[PDB]
């Protein structure tokens, strides 16, 4: 398949991609939230044939020593052997680690999940949010698909109302649910640089020939909460400038779909 760099490269030169997308088009997007009923939150996301499932699970626990003020958020990506022949049984490899870390960071750094509004008793009892990413099919652009599924799944989440009883000192978990304090919708927008052209949402085939990849995660307030150039290759400042700008625009188109899918599920 080194035959295929040449093909993809020459097609680009003629302004085309292998599946007839523009350089700024995403493949068809399917977002569906609420799909794992037993989870507190969930989302199934398809970027073309790329499929990822996120589950939100919450429990109550101790906060971290240094932040007794804050609830806990933790992101794990499983690159399941079933998703890809390049995925192997065992602990996260660096791909799984870097995707997890970048998706967490865009959320955390935007305070998209407001950890301060997750305290039950300061220093002792906080809500602990597990964002558990399950990659079901890898056909390109896990970064975006993952970040999409994760924020979509936070917004889907309904966690049980918890009450701290003052007379008893105890913490009552009520049957009534409520949303998580999700206050922003960060969305990663990823570009493949192949030669001298950047292309949004690369498929597998484009990732196999790209030089390098850059992810810009933006929210609806026009801020950036994560940038990650990944793999090899090099970018020009202006390609970086271009990517930042284009990302905000793709992020708003995607945020809108995230929002519909979120609402379609409370019906």
């Amino acid at each position: 398949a080194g035959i295929m760099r040449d093909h993809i490269i020459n097609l680009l030169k003629e302004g085309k991609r292998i599946d007839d997308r523009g350089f700024e088009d995403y493949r068809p997007i399917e977002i569906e939230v609420g799909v794992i009923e037993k989870a507190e939150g969930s989302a199934l996301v398809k970027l073309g044939s790329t499929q990822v499932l996120v589950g939100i699970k919450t429990s109550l626990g101790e906060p971290f020593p240094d932040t007794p003020n804050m609830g806990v958020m933790t992101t794990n990506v499983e690159l399941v052997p079933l998703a890809s022949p390049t995925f192997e049984p065992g602990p996260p490899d660096e791909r799984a680690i870097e995707l997890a870390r970048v998706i967490d960071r865009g959320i955390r750094e935007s305070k998209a999940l407001n950890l301060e509004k997750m305290v039950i008793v300061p220093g002792k009892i906080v809500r602990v949010v597990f964002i558990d990413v399950h990659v079901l099919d890898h056909d390109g652009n896990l970064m975006d698909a993952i970040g999409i599924a994760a924020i979509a799944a936070l917004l889907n989440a309904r966690v049980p109302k918890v009450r701290y009883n003052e007379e008893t000192g105890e913490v009552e978990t009520l049957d009534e649910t409520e949303p998580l304090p999700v206050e922003k919708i960060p969305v990663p927008v990823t570009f493949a640089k192949i030669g001298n052209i950047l292309v949004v949402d690369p498929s597998l085939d484009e990732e196999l020939v790209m030089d390098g990849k850059i992810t810009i995660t933006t929210d609806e307030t026009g801020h950036i909460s994560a940038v990650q150039k990944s793999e090899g290759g090099a970018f020009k400042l202006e390609e970086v400038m271009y990517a930042v700008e284009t990302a905000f625009k793709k992020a708003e188109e995607i945020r809108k779909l995230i929002l519909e899918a979120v609402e379609k599920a409370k019906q």
């Binding site: 037993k38 044939s49 499932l53 699970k57 399941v80 052997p81 022949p85 399950h134 099919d137």
Partner: protein, 236 residues
């Protein structure tokens, strides 16, 4: 403390009734074969690869393909979040699933190769190993792998004295026995048989028989899901 409400079950089912079951083949681009199964509250994907290159020759068998199965539960699949990673349970189910699928496969046909089966439990509710074996045959059939039969699987149990078909979480948790069976229906060959619990011989045997009836029922859904697959390539 009540599992038969006179003499129906908690979810309204009769002693020998199945939870609703939906299966679909060819759901993943990358696998050589796939199936998705919703069996009651269970949601499971099966992926197959390939026959593919086994590494290294050390692991290579000279006259045959080896079968490698990995059963795994997503952290969000269970009521209390599961840290990811195989545990002893998953290791054991992997092994017994392997043993359930091996007799159905003509391994001598692809020597020096591995056929990898991945069973991912996205939502669990009891019967995951049987729902997994059921979807793992469809997925093998999906990958164009030659097989002496499909492997159909179903569990019976004993709850509040009674032998019943296809436990849910509650009945399994609180019941007296769980008897998963897997069979190759055409010739009545049992490729999986486990019993967890406490049974008389005659209760064990009625359970084995009952689960074999539900496995035969599940077998007709497997054929139907495969028939559905060739109605979709017969376009056109």
């Amino acid at each position: 403390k009540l599992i038969d409400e006179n003499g129906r079950r908690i979810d309204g089912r009769k002693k020998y009734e199945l939870r609703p079951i939906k299966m679909e083949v060819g759901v993943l681009k990358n696998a050589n074969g796939s199936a998705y199964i919703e069996w009651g509250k269970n949601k499971i994907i099966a992926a197959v690869y390939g026959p593919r290159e086994l590494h290294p020759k050390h692991l290579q068998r000279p006259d045959r393909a080896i079968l490698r199965v990995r059963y795994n539960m997503a952290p969000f699949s269970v009521e209390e979040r599961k840290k990811p990673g195989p545990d002893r349970r998953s290791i054991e189910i992997s092994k017994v699933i392997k043993g359930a699928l091996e007799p159905a496969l003509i391994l001598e046909m692809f020597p020096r190769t591995a056929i990898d089966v991945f069973i991912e439990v996205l939502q669990a509710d009891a019967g995951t190993r049987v729902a997994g074996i059921t979807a793992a045959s469809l997925a093998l059939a999906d990958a164009g792998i030659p097989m002496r039969d499909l492997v159909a699987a179903c569990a019976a149990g004993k709850i509040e004295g009674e032998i019943v078909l296809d436990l849910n979480k509650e009945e399994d948790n609180y019941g007296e026995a769980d008897v998963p069976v897997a069979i190759m229906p055409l010739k009545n060959d049992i490729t999986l048989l486990q019993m967890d619990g406490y049974l008389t011989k005659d209760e064990f045997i009625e359970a084995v028989k009952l689960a074999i009836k539900g496995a035969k029922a599940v077998y007709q859904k497997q054929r139907e899901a495969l028939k559905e697959k060739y109605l979709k390539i017969a376009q056109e």
